[PDB]
Design a protein around this nucleic acid. Sequence first.
RNA 1: AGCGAAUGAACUUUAAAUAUGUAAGAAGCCCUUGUUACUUAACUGAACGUGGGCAUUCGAAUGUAUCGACACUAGUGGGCCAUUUUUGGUAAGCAGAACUGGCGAUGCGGGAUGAACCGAA
RNA 2: CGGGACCGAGGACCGCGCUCUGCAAGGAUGCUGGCGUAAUGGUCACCAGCGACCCGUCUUGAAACACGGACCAAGGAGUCAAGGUUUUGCGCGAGUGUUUGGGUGUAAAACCCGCACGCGUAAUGAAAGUGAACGUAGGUGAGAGCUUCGGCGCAUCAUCGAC
Lengths: 52, 108, 150, 129, 150
Amino acid sequence: VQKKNPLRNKQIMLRLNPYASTFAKEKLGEVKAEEGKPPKVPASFKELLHEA
Amino acid sequence: PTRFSKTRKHRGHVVGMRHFHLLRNHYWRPSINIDKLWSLVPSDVREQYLSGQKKDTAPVIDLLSHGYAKLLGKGRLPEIPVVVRARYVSAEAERKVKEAGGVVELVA
Amino acid sequence: FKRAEKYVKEYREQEREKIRLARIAKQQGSFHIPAEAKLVFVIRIKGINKIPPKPRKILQLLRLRQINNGVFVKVTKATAEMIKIVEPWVAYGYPNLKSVRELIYKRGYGKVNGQRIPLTDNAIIEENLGKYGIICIEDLIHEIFTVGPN
Amino acid sequence: RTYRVGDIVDIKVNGAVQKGMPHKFYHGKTGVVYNVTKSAVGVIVYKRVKHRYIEKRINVRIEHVKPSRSREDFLRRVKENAELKKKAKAEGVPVQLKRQPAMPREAHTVSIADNKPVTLAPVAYETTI
Amino acid sequence: GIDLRWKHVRSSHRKAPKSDNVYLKLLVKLYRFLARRTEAPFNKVVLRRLFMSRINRPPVSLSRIARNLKNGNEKKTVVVVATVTDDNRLLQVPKMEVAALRFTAKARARIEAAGGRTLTLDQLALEKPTGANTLLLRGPKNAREAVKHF
RNA sequence: AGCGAAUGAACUUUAAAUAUGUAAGAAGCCCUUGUUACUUAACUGAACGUGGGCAUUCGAAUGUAUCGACACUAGUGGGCCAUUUUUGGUAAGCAGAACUGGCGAUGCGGGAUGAACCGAA
RNA sequence: CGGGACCGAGGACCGCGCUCUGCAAGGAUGCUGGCGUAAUGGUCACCAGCGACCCGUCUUGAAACACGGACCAAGGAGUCAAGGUUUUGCGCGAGUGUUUGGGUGUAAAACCCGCACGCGUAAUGAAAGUGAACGUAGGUGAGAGCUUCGGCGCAUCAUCGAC
């Protein structure tokens, strides 16, 4: 009798998708990047970027 | 009826030769085909004839009494001898009557 | 539940894979050319007045009959040429996962027996697409976003 | 070339005789032969008037008529569809029988070591000098 | 505004008879119930032929029934939604079970004399509610002076 | 584009934009058999039939409340304006066609105002 | 995580579900105040803001021009008959039509009766005239429905035959 927005009503979200509660609890929208020291940009990329 | 008309709804929105002195009685000659020939027999006698309860008698039909002058040969006839009294007849109608076992007699 | 978990993991891995490939090419001194987009969302933003018969027919075939109507299109040359012809009436581009899930969750209506039925249950998607393996709205979103066989 | 009734032909009026052509509409059109003459041929053409097709007939000299290759691709595709379907039934492996539209290109990597890019301006400096 | 090049088409067939026959209305109610509650297409066809007019229901003769009774159809129940008329050119009548809207007096008498039986459509619905072992017949629709003059 | 390919818009290995014709299947594809009153030097092609083989995927995309045949009835069937294409012209205006769109039949918001403008029905 | 506006459609239960004693899950309930009457609401007259050419007819593509309109009451214009044609309902059905007429009557009604006749049941030809089965009233391809699941195949269409 009434279409309810699942993005506003959490119960419709849990009805249509049981994994939404697990997503919210485990915070899978806030996953940090993999650890490790990032290697620096090669020089030739920089001379190519700043070449007139 | 006037009340069912559309105007009530539209209220507010508006060779050869010539034959002098022809007499059709000269050319009166009605025709019947042989598949309706048994229909001229009365129904109950027709039923005994078709069932086979009359092995010694044959029916005689007068077409002029029933209102026909020519016997034509559309259809087929059963193997029952029938005497036919007609003013006119066609050759194949006479052939089918003779194959049925009857005879066609000419009357005026 | 398991299928939605798998889909979320696949989205995260494909994003990290694209980033890793770009970084590896940059570190090796080359450029990684990304794959061209497979999904285009098309919105009709101009009215139905004074339109030539060929763009009229293309909009009819793309099911853009009213202004502010949007559709999902798989990118082939046969569809790209049509959208290129009806450029003066549409705005089209490459939608992301958030756009797909927002559109399907908020304005999701299925065509069931010629009727426009809101997607309020997984059941409607199940009896309308279960022969293609799509049993819920997460399968529908995954199929639309990744451009699957169905 | 002796043309026959039912053959599908292309019309190309060769030469620069376009000064006084009565009907330039049928140049480059494709039609069906219904009548054959020693130096003429009868071609059935269809014209589109709004929502319906009207049927026109023209008499074209043989010098402006070439046989068309419209059904060559269809007959050819029928032939290799039959042959690869027989081959697939022989070897017991599925094979594609449907031609597909062009798909978008996938991801790939372009090397720079021997193909250093050239920087271009909106005009060429060699043309400026 | 929405651009609809095509047009939704209203139904082009009868849904109810124009006749004011109360017994025909009862027959329509019975066969509406039968066509709704059974899977047999025979009930739907009989309901549609009950809807039709007289020029769409030409008469069927005893000779036509005797023709269609041949070749393994001797024991089938003949169903004709029309008037069954007598044909006097057919001299002998085979035994037959015919269900019809109405019979002429001569046709009914000749059937009962030959040893067959005549039924109404409600009797047909009671004996064969699924249309089992039935031979459905129509008469010559184009055998009319108007159709000749068309 | 090249002519460190040949040759010289009329050069070409290759190849434009714009719309545009034809074709894209089982209702189809061939093979074989004979006849021919067609045709061919010709049982040779083709047509006519005959039989057989091809359903292992029915042989691009997208859309598909879009079917067909009758019956009866009615108005209009050498109207206006505009974009584009094309043929002519004039001192300047302008005159023919082809397609498309709008109007005559049409309300609404904006062009202060309005048959032909914009948005949108 | 706040702040604001508009809306409350349905009327026992059923279903999807969830954070599972219950619930924000297939559409509003709970508590409280004043009044219980012109207070809400409605009609009429007027003022105020915004909007708004006088109708009909003719013309062409259209406006314009032109014509009619002082006002009110009553009257006032696609009707009937005959003959066709298509469709709808009805009765009978290879037949059908009582009502020219007669009988009868509670008397222009109703009821009853039959010979002829009209149309249909046979066409074609100028006419003389002749006059529709080789076959389960044919063969082939479709075709609703039925089927003992082998097929039978209505109407109708296309085609080749027959009279």
